[PDB]
């Protein structure tokens, strides 16, 4: 016996059919639209939405005045409004099933650097975040797979230790100045 915790999920599910052009083409468009690394990063969001929809399936089977549906459903409807997926006018549990994969990947940090005009490419943004140039209010975030909350969006900036924000230059601009 030790003092360790052995719990861990798996965060993706490999699909049933390995090779079909309708699926390989439809995953690879989303990789190219959103700068993802491999197919696992598509198979991850698709797996989290496979759980959000499956939990909302069993709530729709219950009685409409069942208190378990009223409490647990109003939490799930709350947790999607805060990450900017559903909306205030559409906060009913029927609409959770009307969600798509790229509804979620609009809220990855890799895409929200690009949509805000900080990066000049969707690929240039995955650079910057891993290059530690991006901060969320005070915190250098080093992961593109970072679901920006709806209040956590309107201030995302250039990480004051960076050459872009606070302006101490890196290795390259120092060595070029060591010649002239």
């Amino acid at each position: 016996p030790v003092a360790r915790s052995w719990v861990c999920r798996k965060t993706y599910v490999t699909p049933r059919r390995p090779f079909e052009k309708s699926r390989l083409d439809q995953e690879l468009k989303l990789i190219g639209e959103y700068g993802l690394r491999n197919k696992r990063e598509v198979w991850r969001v698709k797996f989290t939405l496979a759980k959000i929809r499956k939990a909302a399936r069993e709530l729709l089977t219950l009685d409409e005045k069942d208190p378990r549906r009223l409490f647990e459903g109003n939490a799930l409807l709350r947790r999607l409004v805060r990450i900017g997926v559903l909306d205030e006018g559409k906060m009913k549990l029927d609409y959770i099933l009307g969600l798509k994969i790229e509804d979620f990947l609009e809220r990855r940090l890799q895409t929200q650097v690009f949509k805000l005009g900080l990066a000049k490419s969707i690929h240039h943004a995955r650079v910057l975040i891993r290059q530690r140039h991006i901060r969320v209010r005070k915190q250098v975030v080093n992961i593109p797979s970072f679901i920006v909350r709806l209040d956590s969006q309107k201030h995302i900036d250039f990480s004051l230790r960076s050459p872009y924000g606070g302006g101490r230059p890196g290795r390259v601009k120092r060595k070029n100045a060591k010649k002239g």
């Binding site: 083409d25 690879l28 468009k29 990789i31 190219g32 993802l36 690394r37 491999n38």
Partner: protein
């Protein structure tokens, strides 16, 4: 019966050395290449007989 022909067609090949060539890309830039390659540029095609490895 006779086992004497064991690596016949292996040894009878002319040993060709692999060509010096530049390295491929990896990570998402390899996946960046395929999205541009397949879904951004269009070749005007009417019959769809141009496979991705179509030597004519």
């Amino acid at each position: 019966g006779s086992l004497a022909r064991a690596g016949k067609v292996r040894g009878q090949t002319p040993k060709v050395a692999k060509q010096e060539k530049k390295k491929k890309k990896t990570g998402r830039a390899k996946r960046r290449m395929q999205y541009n390659r397949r879904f951004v540029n269009v070749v005007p095609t009417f019959g769809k007989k141009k496979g991705p490895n179509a030597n004519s």
